[PDB]
């Protein structure tokens, strides 16, 4: 067995040490005992590997010297904290596979090395300790964006405007339920926290508060569903989306579009959903009048997606749905022949309204639909290749005996293939 023993430790320092030690022990695959007193901590581990033993020793030393009232001990703590942070930040580099994430990681490490405050340093360490475990590089983007935002806003010369922006942004991030919104808020906040331009700060603070207004209105509309008050709130959401397009900060309009789409998807056939589709059309028209391409294409995309969901619900059939940057795909399964005819009939009935490029593929008892806009003729012909390949892969896998859960997985692997063939 291996043992550690930690004298004169203050309770807040004690409430740190075990957390980090446990995470290392759970990384190394070893059992642990811990015991606590007023002023003392004792720990024992099954046959701990020397590399982890040295890292735990480094952390224990750092904890004592971070508590110590001596300025030279606190300086040595800043050094050991930044040293451990730098090793963890380096450990993330090979694991991560997106260059913007690698940029964010290197920036976080640099911001921490510039930071005067051990508590900032420790939360940056906490973010990196989450990132190293994290399964999704997009969650790593959220984590590192939050890390960067915390560090860059917490700086020793930071204006209260920057602190207010960070507080608004992080509160919005904590309140939100869709990761895409969290990204769009945090990214704008990070760009503000990196900058010194008071116009960028002002624009971002208004934009974050306009996102907050959108988030709050969606909470009100949702929780008060089945009412004239919710029906009134739909109009107000759409009108803030229109104001966002009139101002041109159209990333928040992307938020508002998605918020309306959630409401519409969550309450099929309702008067609310009936208001939402009509709103989404005016928002698309407003986005076309303002030339905001990806946003306008997103409005078209969401409209068509609602329509196939509505067709599916009216047919009462199984479907699967996934999304991408400039296209949508919906896969229908077990569709009865008269419903194959009727779905085809309705896809045209949608298409001749919305003006989209659209492709439909029929194989076995599966139909794959793909919709795309703004892309070139050649990109559309490659998308035509992809949807045909998606139908081939799905039906040949189902012919090979792929279960429902295996086809549900396969759409993720095909969505990745569709990025890999880019």
């Amino acid at each position: 067995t291996v043992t550690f023993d930690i004298t004169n430790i203050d309770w807040e320092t004690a409430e740190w040490i075990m957390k980090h030690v446990y995470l290392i022990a759970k990384k190394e695959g070893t059992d642990v005992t811990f015991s606590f007193k007023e002023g003392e901590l004792q720990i024992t581990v099954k046959n701990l590997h020397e590399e982890a033993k040295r890292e735990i020793e480094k952390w224990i030393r750092a904890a004592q010297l971070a508590q110590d009232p001596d300025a030279e001990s606190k300086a040595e703590a800043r050094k050991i904290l930044n040293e451990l942070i730098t090793e963890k930040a380096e450990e993330l580099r090979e694991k991560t596979k997106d260059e913007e994430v690698r940029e964010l990681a290197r920036e976080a490490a640099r911001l921490a090395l510039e930071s005067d405050d051990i508590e900032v340093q420790r939360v940056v360490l906490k973010a990196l300790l989450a990132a190293l475990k994290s399964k999704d590089e997009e969650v790593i983007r959220l984590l590192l964006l939050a890390a960067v935002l915390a560090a860059a806003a917490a700086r020793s010369g930071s204006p209260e405007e920057k602190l207010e922006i960070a507080k608004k942004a992080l509160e919005l991030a904590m309140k939100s339920k869709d990761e895409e919104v969290i990204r769009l808020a945090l990214l704008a906040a990070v760009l503000a926290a990196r900058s010194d331009d008071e116009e960028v700060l002002k624009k971002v603070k208004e934009a974050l508060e306009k996102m907050e207004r959108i988030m709050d209105l969606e909470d009100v509309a949702r929780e008060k569903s089945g009412s004239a008050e919710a029906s009134q709130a739909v109009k107000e959401i759409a009108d803030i989306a229109e104001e966002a397009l009139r101002e041109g900060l159209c990333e928040v309009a992307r938020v508002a579009l998605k918020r309306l789409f959630k409401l519409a998807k969550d309450y099929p056939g309702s008067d609310v959903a009936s208001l939402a589709k009509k709103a989404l059309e005016k928002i698309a028209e407003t986005a076309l009048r303002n030339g905001c391409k990806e946003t306008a294409e997103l409005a078209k995309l969401l409209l068509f997606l609602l329509l196939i969901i509505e067709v599916v619900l009216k047919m009462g059939v199984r479907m699967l749905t996934h999304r991408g940057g400039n296209a949508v795909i919906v896969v229908i399964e077990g569709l009865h022949p008269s419903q194959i005819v009727q779905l085809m009939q309705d896809v045209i009935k949608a298409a001749k309204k919305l003006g989209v490029t659209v492709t439909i593929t029929v194989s076995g008892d599966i139909v794959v639909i793909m919709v795309v806009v703004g892309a070139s003729d050649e990109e559309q012909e490659e998308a035509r290749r992809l949807v045909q390949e998606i139908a081939r892969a799905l039906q040949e896998a189902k012919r090979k005996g792929a279960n429902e859960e295996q086809l549900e997985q396969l759409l993720r692997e095909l969505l990745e293939r569709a990025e890999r063939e880019g």
């Binding site: 900032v120 475990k133 602190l163």
Partner: peptide
């Protein structure tokens, strides 16, 4: 300085809580 030191602690705590929120669904 005091109001900024409190706001910084609020940011840090909010960030810890957000790191937990981002982790706990995983």
């Amino acid at each position: 300085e005091e109001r900024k030191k409190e706001l910084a602690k609020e940011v840090i705590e909010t960030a810890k809580k957000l790191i937990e929120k981002l982790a706990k669904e995983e």
